[PDB]
Amino acid sequence: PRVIVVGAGMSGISAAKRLSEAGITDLLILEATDHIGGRMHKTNFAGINVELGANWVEGVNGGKMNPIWPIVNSTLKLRNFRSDFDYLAQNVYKEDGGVYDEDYVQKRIELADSVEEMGEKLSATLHASGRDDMSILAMQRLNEHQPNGPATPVDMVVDYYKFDYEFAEPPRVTSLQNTVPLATFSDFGDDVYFVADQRGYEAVVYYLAGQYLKTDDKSGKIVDPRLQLNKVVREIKYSPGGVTVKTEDNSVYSADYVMVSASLGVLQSDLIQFKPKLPTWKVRAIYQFDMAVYTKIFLKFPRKFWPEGKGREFFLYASSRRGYYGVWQEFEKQYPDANVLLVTVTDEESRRIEQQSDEQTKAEIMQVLRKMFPGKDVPDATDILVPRWWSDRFYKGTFSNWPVGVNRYEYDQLRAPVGRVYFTGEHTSEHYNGYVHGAYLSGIDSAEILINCAQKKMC
Numbered sequence: 357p358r359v360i361v362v363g364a365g366m367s368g369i370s371a372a373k374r375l376s377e378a379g380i381t382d383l384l385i386l387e388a389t390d391h392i393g394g395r396m397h398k399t400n401f402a403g404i405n406v407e408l409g410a411n412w413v414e415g416v417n418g419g420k421m422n423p424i425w426p427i428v429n430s431t432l433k434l435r436n437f438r439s440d441f442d443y444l445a446q447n448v449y450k451e452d453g454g455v456y457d458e459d460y461v462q463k464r465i466e467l468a469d470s471v472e473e474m475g476e477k478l479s480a481t482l483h484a485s486g487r488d489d490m491s492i493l494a495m496q497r498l499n500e501h502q503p504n505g506p507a508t509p510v511d512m513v514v515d516y517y518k519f520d521y522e523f524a525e526p527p528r529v530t531s532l533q534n535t536v537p538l539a540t541f542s543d544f545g546d547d548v549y550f551v552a553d554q555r556g557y558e559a560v561v562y563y564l565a566g567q568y569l570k571t572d573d574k575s576g577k578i579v580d581p582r583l584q585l586n587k588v589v590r591e592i593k594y595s596p597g598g599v600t601v602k603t604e605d606n607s608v609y610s611a612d613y614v615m616v617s618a619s620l621g622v623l624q625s626d627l628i629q630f631k632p633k634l635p636t637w638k639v640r641a642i643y644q645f646d647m648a649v650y651t652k653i654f655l656k657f658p659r660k661f662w663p664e665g666k667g668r669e670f671f672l673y674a675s676s677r678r679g680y681y682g683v684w685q686e687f688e689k690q691y692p693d694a695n696v697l698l699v700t701v702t703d704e705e706s707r708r709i710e711q712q713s714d715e716q717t718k719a720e721i722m723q724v725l726r727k728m729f730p731g732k733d734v735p736d737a738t739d740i741l742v743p744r745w746w747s748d749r750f751y752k753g754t755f756s757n758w759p760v761g762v763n764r765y766e767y768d769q770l771r772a773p774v775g776r777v778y779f780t781g782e783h784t785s786e787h788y789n790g791y792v793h794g795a796y797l798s799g800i801d802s803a804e805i806l807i808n809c810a811q812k813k814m815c
């Protein structure tokens with residue numbers, strides 16, 4: 357059968373590969389941008405390539421092998437380093453000057469970890485139907501016996517690092533049942549490894565694609581006509597017998613099926629019109645799940661003024677305004693002598709920041725840094741990079757997050773096809789939504805579902 361795959365991100369390339377492996381090679385991959393990889397994407401900053409999207413292989417050294425690891429660590433050998441969060445207690449900055457006492461902070465961290473641990477025990481006892489689920493915040497109130505969760509600045513930044521920095525939305529919106537504990541770590545291990553290779557984390561996608569799409573022998577560039585870049589799909593028409601897909605440049609294509617890999621945010625936006633309209637059950641499942649935003653703000657300075665050394669890689673700023681420029685990283689190992697710092701924000705701050713200029717954001721960050729390093733002469737950043745994923749119509753966010761209120765059955769409706777319209781992508785991964793390995797396995801699973809229906813008529 358002929359199949360059109362919308363999008364050349366990890367799940368699209370992964371699904372096309374699986375299909376090709378089942379012998380379905382009459383494929384047509386339509387990608388909106390001028391390159392493949394989607395949310396795995398590097399860029400030059402300060403004369404170095406940094407990751408605008410995914411940057412870590414998460415879940416390593418555990419009971420099961422994360423399928424992406426071997427590709428990164430063995431097959432391509434992309435340069436990488438295990439992240440160590442053990443020294444955070446020595447690195448939490450007060451809103452107005454210097455770090456807090458390390459012992460005081462380690463105990464707050466312990467308390468937070470301990471509460472989360474009781475949350476894990478509780479979560480195991482809830483019903484599969486989701487009828488007793490609650491937000492992570494509700495679990496914190498119940499385990500701590502208080503009318504509120506973390507609320508002083510230090511407690512809040514610790515809370516932000518433990519949950520928002522992983523999920524990109526606050527614990528009060530997040531489903532406990534479906535995030536605590538998280539399958540990624542429970543299955544693949546607790547370690548995470550930061551990819552810092554000039555070829556980019558995206559090389560993994562290029563590698564997969566080259567296993568079945570044609571590449572030039574000199575360049576190594578993909579030259580297979582089954583892949584077409586700069587094709588923005590704007591309309592997908594379907595009937596019991598087949599589909600037609602129209603692109604923004606006016607091309608029109610036909611096929612027996614279509615495999616949609618665009619992000620949940622793109623699907624919540626209407627960039628793609630379905631005709632007829634998707635059924636109400638489908639539409640509701642789409643809008644009830646969350647597409648979060650995680651913004652990696654890179655900064656380059658004329659000289660270093662922050663600490664380097666053991667346990668210095670990650671540091672937090674305990675603002676009295678929850679989530680305000682709170683999680684920092686320095687790259688002495690990754691990009692030695694580069695003078696770059698990375699601050700990450702999410703959710704509300706991400707949408708506010710994408711809407712203002714870089715200069716304005718730079719100025720807000722300079723004020724925080726000066727407050728953090730009162731003894732130093734902090735030079736202004738010479739350059740800044742603010743990724744605008746939420747504003748980008750082809751992504752509208754960075755990764756899904758599971759909100760309280762949605763149960764497994766409704767999450768599964770996200771994965772469900774509609775007639776001949778199939779869906780794939782990280783938001784359809786059964787237990788790994790939000791990750792690169794989740795996009796990867798999702799392409800395989802979605803492809804297998806279409807293969808069984810199309811080839812064996814077992815739908």
Ligand SMILES: Cc1cc2nc3c(=O)[nH]c(=O)nc-3n(C[C@H](O)[C@H](O)[C@H](O)COP(=O)(O)OP(=O)(O)OC[C@H]3O[C@@H](n4cnc5c(N)ncnc54)[C@H](O)[C@@H]3O)c2cc1C
Binds near residue numbers: 392395588651780
């Ligand atoms: C800032 C950020 C940080 C993250 N951190 C990590 C991390 O460190 N580790 C990790 O494991 N995961 C992380 N993730 C999540 C991970 O990158 C994603 O889960 C995964 O790459 C998503 O792949 P996908 O194929 O599901 O979607 P995408 O990568 O979005 O692929 C979809 C493709 O469809 C295209 N498209 C969209 N609309 C159309 C249209 N109308 N027509 C045609 N094509 C279209 C897009 O251009 C894109 O190429 C991060 C993501 C981001 C953005």
Ligand SMILES: *[C@@H]1O[C@H](CO)[C@@H](O[C@@H]2O[C@H](CO)[C@@H](O)[C@H](O)[C@H]2NC(C)=O)[C@H](O)[C@H]1NC(C)=O
Binds near residue numbers: 417
């Ligand atoms: C990631 O890959 C490196 C690259 O092979 C691993 O380091 C090697 O592992 C073997 C295994 O017996 C040694 O014999 C080699 O000497 C190692 N090379 C180096 C430079 O140490 C490393 O352990 C891998 N990490 C993970 C998490 O799998």
